[PDB]
């Protein structure tokens, strides 16, 4: 998978973009934790578990809280342009950490 930032356009199904985010706490970034099978994210085939979301419709989320990121994603409209960067090592760092 490419590790540089990536531009991804998703067209929203009435239900949603079809993925989950964690992060946006204690200065941590916003990451994709789950991709809903059959959803827009899943069919675009571009987003992955472990992706950090750097911006949505040009709104910088590098320094965002969780709630700020959630509000941005939910309100980004029908055509959502995402800047994402694949960071498996960082995601793993958290996931391992969470297993305690």
């Amino acid at each position: 998978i490419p590790r540089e930032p990536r531009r991804i356009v998703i067209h929203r199904g009435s239900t949603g973009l079809g993925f989950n985010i964690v992060g946006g706490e204690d200065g941590e970034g916003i990451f994709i934790s789950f991709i809903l099978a059959g959803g827009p994210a899943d069919l675009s085939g571009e987003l992955r578990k472990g992706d950090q979301i750097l911006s949505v419709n040009g709104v910088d989320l590098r320094n965002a809280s969780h709630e700020q990121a959630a509000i941005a994603l939910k309100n980004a409209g029908q055509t959502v342009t995402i800047i994402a960067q694949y960071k498996p090592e960082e995601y793993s760092r958290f996931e391992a950490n969470s297993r305690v």
């Binding site: 949603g16 993925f19 989950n20 985010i21 809903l36 959630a70």
Partner: peptide, 6 residues
């Protein structure tokens, strides 16, 4: 702590 569906 938090996980949100979008």
């Amino acid at each position: 702590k938090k996980e949100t569906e979008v």
